[PDB]
Amino acid sequence: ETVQDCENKLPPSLKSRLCEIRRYEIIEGPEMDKHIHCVMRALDFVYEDGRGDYHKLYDPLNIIELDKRHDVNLEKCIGECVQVPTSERAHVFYKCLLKSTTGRTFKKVFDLMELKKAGKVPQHQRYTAEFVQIMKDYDKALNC
Numbered sequence: 320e321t322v323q324d325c326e327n328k329l330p331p332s333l334k335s336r337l338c339e340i341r342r343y344e345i346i347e348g349p350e351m352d353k354h355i356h357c358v359m360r361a362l363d364f365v366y367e368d369g370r371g372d373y374h375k376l377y378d379p380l381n382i383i384e385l386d387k388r389h390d391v392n393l394e395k396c397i398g399e400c401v402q403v404p405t406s407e408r409a410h411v412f413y414k415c416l417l418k419s420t421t422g423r424t425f426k427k428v429f430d431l432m433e434l435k436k437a438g439k440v441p442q443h444q445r446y447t448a449e450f451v452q453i454m455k456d457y458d459k460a461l462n463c
């Protein structure tokens with residue numbers, strides 16, 4: 320199951336707001352809670368109960384932007400998400416990470432993984448100027 324599959328599956332109050340979502344803008348409520356769980360699982364960033372996986376993010380974050388703060392932000396955000404209910408957990412992880420100083424680099428790792436899993440860029444693809452354009456054109460095909 321891919322991010323595209325999760326998007327295909329959006330109910331219709333959320334799908335008119337696709338581009339907001341795909342800009343990493345925060346949207347609340349339990350429809351969003353279950354989209355973001357779907358996508359975080361599709362990208363292999365959270366466990367089944369929806370808890371952030373430290374080890375899926377630590378190395379990828381640090382390769383792009385080497386920074387001690389990724390450890391700190393990961394521990395904080397996992398700590399938060401564990402304390403909310405499972406319906407809400409992956410979304411809370413996602414929201415926390417985006418708000419932290421790791422947000423910048425998280426969006427890059429997230430973009431890269433999305434397009435790697437979509438077969439659109441090679442598995443060793445780095446966050447290059449070319450890649451930024453590939454992402455923009457990919458979004459444009461989606462009306463974003």
Ligand SMILES: NCCc1c[nH]c2ccccc12
Pocket residue numbers: 322340341342343354355358429430433
């Ligand atoms: N290329 C980023 C697309 C994106 C950002 N946040 C999302 C949340 C749900 C699904 C896609 C996204």
